[PDB]
Amino acid sequence: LMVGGLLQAEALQPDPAWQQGKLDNGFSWQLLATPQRPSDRIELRLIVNTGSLSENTQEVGFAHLLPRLALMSSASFTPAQLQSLWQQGIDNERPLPPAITSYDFTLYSLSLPNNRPDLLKDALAWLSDTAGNLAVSEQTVNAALNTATDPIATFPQNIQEPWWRYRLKGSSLIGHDPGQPVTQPVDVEKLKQFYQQWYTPDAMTLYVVGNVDSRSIAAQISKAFSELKGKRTAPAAVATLAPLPPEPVSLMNEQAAQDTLSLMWDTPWHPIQDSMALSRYWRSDLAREALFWHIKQVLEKNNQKNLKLGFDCRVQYQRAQCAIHLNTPVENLTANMTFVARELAALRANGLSQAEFDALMTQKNDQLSKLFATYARTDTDILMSQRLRSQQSGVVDIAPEQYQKLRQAFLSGLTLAELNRELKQQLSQDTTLVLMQPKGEPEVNVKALQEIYNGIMA
Ligand SMILES: [Zn+2]
Ligand SMILES: [Zn+2]
Ligand SMILES: [Zn+2]
Ligand SMILES: [Zn+2]
Ligand SMILES: [Zn+2]
Ligand SMILES: [Zn+2]
Numbered sequence: 001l002m003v004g005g006l007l008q009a010e011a012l013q014p015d016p017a018w019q020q021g022k023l024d025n026g027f028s029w030q031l032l033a034t035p036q037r038p039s040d041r042i043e044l045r046l047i048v049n050t051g052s053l054s055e056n057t058q059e060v061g062f063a064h065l066l067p068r069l070a071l072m073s074s075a076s077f078t079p080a081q082l083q084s085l086w087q088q089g090i091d092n093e094r095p096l097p098p099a100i101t102s103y104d105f106t107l108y109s110l111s112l113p114n115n116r117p118d119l120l121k122d123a124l125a126w127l128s129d130t131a132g133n134l135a136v137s138e139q140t141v142n143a144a145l146n147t148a149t150d151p152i153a154t155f156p157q158n159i160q161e162p163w164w165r166y167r168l169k170g171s172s173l174i175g176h177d178p179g180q181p182v183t184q185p186v187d188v189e190k191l192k193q194f195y196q197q198w199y200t201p202d203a204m205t206l207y208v209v210g211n212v213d214s215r216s217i218a219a220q221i222s223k224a225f226s227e228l229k230g231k232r233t234a235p236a237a238v239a240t241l242a243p244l245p246p247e248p249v250s251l252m253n254e255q256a257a258q259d260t261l262s263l264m265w266d267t268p269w270h271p272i273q274d275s276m277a278l279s280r281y282w283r284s285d286l287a288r289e290a291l292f293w294h295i296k297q298v299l300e301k302n303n304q305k306n307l308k309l310g311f312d313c314r315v316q317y318q319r320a321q322c323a324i325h326l327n328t329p330v331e332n333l334t335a336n337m338t339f340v341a342r343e344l345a346a347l348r349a350n351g352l353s354q355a356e357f358d359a360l361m362t363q364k365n366d367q368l369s370k371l372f373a374t375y376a377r378t379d380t381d382i383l384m385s386q387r388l389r390s391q392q393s394g395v396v397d398i399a400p401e402q403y404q405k406l407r408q409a410f411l412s413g414l415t416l417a418e419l420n421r422e423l424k425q426q427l428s429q430d431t432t433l434v435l436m437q438p439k440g441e442p443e444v445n446v447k448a449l450q451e452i453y454n455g456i457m458a
Contacts, residue, residue, distance in 0.1 A: 012278065015398055017032055025227075027202070034383065036375070041114060042116075042209070043109075044123055044127065045108065045109055046204060047106070047108075047204065048108075049236035050105070051103045052064070055176065055194075060180050061179075061180040063101050066136075067101065067152050069144055070126070070129070070130040074126055074129040074130070081122070088113060089119075101153075102239070104238055114210070114211065120212070124224045127206070132228045134199070138188050141186050162253050167241065171240065173239055196230065201228035201231075202232055205391075209380045241318075243266060244432055248446040248450040249435070251434065256437065258327060258329045259437055260326065263326075263344075264432045264433075265322045269318050269320045271394040272396045283419070286364070287419060287423045291343075296309060306336075307326060309340075314393075315393040316393060318394075334449070337452070344431075345456055350420075351424065352420060361414070431453075433446060
């Protein structure tokens with residue numbers, strides 16, 4: 001017995017449900033078998049770490065063009081077979097385009113019916129044709145440029161948004177719009193060289209979610225993709241944004257019905273490495289949720305003329321963006337902004353009441369109790385999008401039993417004082433006012449609006 005009287009956190013566990021492997025050429029794959037979704041569609045995603053940032057000025061639009069070629073013709077397919085695949089390759093809801101191209105990636109997507117081994121074979125053949133034997137010729141390029149529509153999407157979905165144009169300023173993404181048309185006539189030889197340079201197996205990951213046979217599909221993936229050649233000499237491009245400037249701004253927008261004033265915060269994102277970071281993230285997230293929740297409730301009890309409120313957070317380009325959106329006619333803007341700003345001032349100073357906190361925590365405890373019920377009811381495409389979001393944005397995916405344990409301990413440990421301090425800290429960082437106006441609406445003086453706002457927040 002040691003004579004003393006008055007004298008760590010566990011490692012986070014990656015979710016072992018996600019089986020992973022690497023082929024000898026560096027091709028990566030990840031598989032989530034879903035026997036709880038035995039009849040749901042099989043989702044396949046091929047991410048290639050090649051986007052518009054890979055393009056020099058003689059290659060503008062090349063990354064966006066390549067996937068359209070893959071829809072004109074594919075080496076393993078007759079026209080009839082290619083059409084048959086794609087007629088049966090789109091999800092029943094939240095359908096995805098065949099490919100999405102962006103600054104630092106291209107994403108190919110197929111959604112197959114359940115219990116169709118033939119279509120799984122075809123899907124893998126289409127994806128391997130695309131990955132290593134893309135049909136790049138004068139004939140396919142001409143055909144692609146003469147389509148009535150553009151089946152290839154971008155991320156962000158609308159690069160032309162005045163908000164996006166503003167947000168892009170000071171970044172490395174300028175002059176690399178991912179959906180730009182190619183310069184014609186196309187140097188087909190240069191296009192093929194670009195494809196061979198940048199479509200290398202070490203820059204690819206295949207993801208599969210569904211009630212599949214994990215033993216046979218691993219073997220099929222190896223046989224489909226192990227012959228790909230090439231290696232990147234440098235790390236793949238990573239798209240990064242500059243910090244959001246602090247100044248208020250008005251942006252005219254041609255699709256807006258009415259104004260949206262956004263109260264925004266933008267900060268560097270630090271991926272969660274350990275349990276302590278996880279807890280800090282959850283405290284911050286819950287404060288954000290609490291505030292939105294509280295304002296929504298106050299609004300339901302105290303109607304404000306023509307106000308609709310929105311709230312969201314995203315992690316993208318290594319930045320965390322959290323926004324409160326006030327959708328309002330311009331005639332009601334100052335009143336509606338004042339309504340929200342007075343809530344923020346009160347929450348900054350005093351936070352939640354104990355009763356409000358206890359309500360919140362009952363609700364969060366309820367949601368946690370529903371964890372596995374929610375999971376069982378989750379469509380394979382949602383499982384897939386969650387995984388890609390985790391992977392692309394660096395937001396950690398942990399074993400669900402560990403999640404349940406750590407989240408329970410977070411909720412049971414959290415005090416009013418702690419949540420209110422987090423609220424105070426968050427709201428003590430100045431917001432950034434971003435006003436979107438409809439085209440044709442007289443410009444609002446956002447400096448004046450900022451002064452009014454500053455008055456309330458004093
Ligand atoms: Zn022509
Ligand atoms: Zn396009
Ligand atoms: Zn938003
Ligand atoms: Zn309040
Ligand atoms: Zn689905
Ligand atoms: Zn277990």
